[PDB]
């Protein structure tokens, strides 16, 4: 009946696995054994941003590395001026259960969504001057886990219904749908060249998609539990993963396999956010133990800890310029580090 | 020189209005209480929703003694709830509604309660436990055509606690059955409570009009206990 299909499907997995093993020429540690350590990074909390009433679930930076958007589960999406610590806008949300936020590269729009299953796009440069909704993207049958802009008219989204979608804001409807995840997709990171983007789901895997074609290029596995964070290596040829198994791993698109694992025996809590530095040498990972650690991305050496939060760290972000790192936590405060 | 300071003072003026609005919104926000109404599809959640409303999130707002309650029912999700349940860490309590007549689903309900109670992020939130459809349970028990021992062998070795206060006219069989159902959940809760949170069991029907009063009463004690723990009185 289906014996041939089953046999071929089972054998193809080993076909891929053997090629991966053969390509496994040498572990990254053996190539990075002699290279100097970063040292110890004594990053200090420079600013603390207060005004959110409840847990902060998402935070994102603008292209200019000054303006900062953050979404709290009290129904507010504040835009902070990081240099001055002042606020610019306070967008009241129709639903209190926001779970993600994004800053359009142009800065004219800001996005948010959550258990409402609707991705709402806001306009911060209206003719009247007051922040107001611009579109309410609907079509996902699950909570919106992450959303990022490719440009002012396209936003890529991830939903708890195990699908990722690409929207056209003016049209207000999907254009290409990404299917293949087995569990809830929890995060996505658009490529620096915005041609590809990778998303991690609650199935112990991350997948590489093509924004234009919509096909699945590569599925990455190796984690043991749900993946909660994803971040592209700045070069665009690798990406880091955060998961509930208390480890972070670095995957390479061309090699098609894990290149390094970042773990410690005293860490038994999950990773909630992952973000590289500008040069890619420093990997910053937030944890449920209220601590954000700094991993040397080439030697898997913990070079520092950003201990300043009560309650879990929710979101992590590095300025495009690289002059600061933003940390949001369920303590309802945002802290800027450098 | 003039332009820079003009812009900076304008930004400060805008931030002042933002702060004022946030202050008023904090007043409103902390004035209300937030509840996560949770339970199986066959549980009579709709009956409770109607009972409040007489006064894909089906938010429900009701008011008792000038205290504003806000009740949420997340119905637009899949069955894998382990990720969106974390959004409700701040809720005052979880309203767990249970069908006490469906013995097949009782173990599923107990497992869900066990997971909610011990979850790393929800193990600070008290649970108001509503054992719904008690008239159906009574009819099924006096009917005799179904036995609870087949699904819970421990029933043959259970006797009602002295504190049980059966309503007038109840057969001993029905009170024993319902108090066993209650005691399963109480066992789960007392196994690892650690005094951080408590479960408040109640019985109710589809034609009961006092569920909002019960939620108000239970929330009062939940907040009272949290405050006393905050001030080190315990």
């Amino acid at each position: 009946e289906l014996d041939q299909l089953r046999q071929e499907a089972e054998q193809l997995k080993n076909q891929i696995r053997d090629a991966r093993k053969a390509c496994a020429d040498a572990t990254l540690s053996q190539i990075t054994n002699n290279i100097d350590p970063v040292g110890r990074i004594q990053m200090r909390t420079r600013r603390t941003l207060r005004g959110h009433l409840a847990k902060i679930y998402a935070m994102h930076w603008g292209t200019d590395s000054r303006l900062l958007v953050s979404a709290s589960q009290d129904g507010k999406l504040i835009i902070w001026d990081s240099y001055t610590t002042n606020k610019v806008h306070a967008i009241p949300l129709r639903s209190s259960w926001v779970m993600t936020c994004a800053y359009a590269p142009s800065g004219n729009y800001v996005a948010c969504g959550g258990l409402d299953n609707i991705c709402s796009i806001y306009n911060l440069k209206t003719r009247e001057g007051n922040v107001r909704v611009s579109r309410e993207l609907a079509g996902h049958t699950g909570y919106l886990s992450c959303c990022r802009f490719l440009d002012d008219n396209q936003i890529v989204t991830s939903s708890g219904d195990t699908t990722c979608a690409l929207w056209d804001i003016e049209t207000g409807q999907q254009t290409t749908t990404f299917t293949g995840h087995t569990g809830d997709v929890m995060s996505l990171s658009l490529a620096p060249d915005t041609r590809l983007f990778v998303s991690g789901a609650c199935d112990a895997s991350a997948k590489l998609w093509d924004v234009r074609e919509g096909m699945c290029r590569q599925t990455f596995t190796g984690h043991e539990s749900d993946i909660n964070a994803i971040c592209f290596f700045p070069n665009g040829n690798a990406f880091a993963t955060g998961s509930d198994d208390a480890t972070c791993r670095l995957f390479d698109l061309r090699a098609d396999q894990e290149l390094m694992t970042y773990s410690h025996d005293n860490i038994i809590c999950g990773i909630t956010s992952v973000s590289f530095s500008k040069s890619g040498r420093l990997l910053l990972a937030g944890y449920d133990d209220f601590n954000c650690n700094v991993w040397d991305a080439l030697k898997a050496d913990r070079a520092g800890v950003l201990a300043g939060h009560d309650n879990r760290v929710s979101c992590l972000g590095v300025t495009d310029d690289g002059m600061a790192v933003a940390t949001g936590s369920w303590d309802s405060f945002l802290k800027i580090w450098n | 020189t003039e332009d820079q300071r003009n812009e900076e003072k304008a930004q400060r003026e805008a931030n002042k209005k933002i702060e004022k609005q946030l202050q008023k919104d904090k007043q409103v926000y902390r004035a209300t209480h937030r509840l996560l109404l949770l339970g199986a599809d066959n549980s009579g959640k709709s009956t409770i929703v109607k009972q409040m409303r007489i006064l894909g999130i089906f938010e429900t707002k009701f008011q008792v003694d000038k205290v504003n309650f806000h009740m949420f029912d997340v119905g637009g999700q899949r069955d894998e709830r382990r990720k969106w349940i974390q959004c409700f860490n701040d809720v005052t309590a979880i309203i767990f509604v249970v069908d006490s007549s469906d013995y097949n689903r009782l173990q599923e309900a107990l497992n869900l309660f066990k997971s909610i109670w011990n979850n790393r992020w929800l193990r600070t939130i008290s649970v108001i436990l509503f054992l719904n459809k008690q008239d159906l349970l009574a009819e099924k028990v006096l009917a005799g055509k179904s036995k609870i021992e087949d699904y819970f062998p421990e029933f043959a070795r259970y006797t009602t606690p002295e504190d049980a206060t059966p309503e007038p006219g109840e057969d001993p069989r029905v009170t024993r059955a319902k108090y066993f159902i209650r005691d399963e959940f109480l066992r789960i809760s007392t196994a690892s409570g650690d005094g951080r949170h408590y479960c408040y069991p109640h019985f109710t029907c589809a034609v009961d009009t006092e569920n909002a009063r019960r939620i108000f009463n239970d929330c009062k004690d939940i907040i009272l206990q949290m405050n006393l723990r905050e001030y080190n009185l315990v």
Epitope: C202, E224, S225, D245, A246 | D79, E80, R82, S115, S192
Partner: nanobody, 126 residues
């Protein structure tokens, strides 16, 4: 990959006994609470029993207590379910399931739809 594969099952005369074996590979078996879940024909998923990390904590659904007994061997990353005196109502597809995250007492894994950390399943016929 996080691979769970079940073994055992098959036709059994009413009564008798069987032994289900789930081989866990790709993840640290010692670190996870593990469960058995059943889906009878024409019925939804049901949770059978669970065993904690060490084996010092155990629980069963009442309908099988005294008939089944779970066991695990951490050193060989294998989980066992020994079934005795199978009633005809016990015929169902049995899956070995792993709780989603390590070092926790909570699990959300009896899903009508797909769930990631669970084997293909074995059918037991009485």
């Amino acid at each position: 990959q996080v691979q769970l594969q079940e073994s055992g099952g098959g036709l059994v005369q009413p009564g008798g006994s069987l032994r289900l074996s789930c081989a866990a590979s790709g993840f640290t078996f010692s670190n996870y609470k593990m469960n058995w879940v059943r889906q009878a024909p024409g019925k939804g998923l049901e949770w059978v029993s669970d065993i904690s990390q060490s084996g010092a904590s155990i629980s069963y659904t009442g309908s099988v207590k005294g008939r089944f007994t779970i066991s695990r061997d951490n050193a060989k990353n294998t989980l066992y379910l020994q079934m005795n005196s199978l009633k005809p109502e016990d015929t169902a597809v049995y899956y070995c399931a792993r709780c989603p995250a390590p070092f926790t007492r909570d699990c959300f894994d009896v899903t009508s739809t797909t769930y990631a950390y669970r084997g293909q399943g074995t059918q037991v016929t009485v």
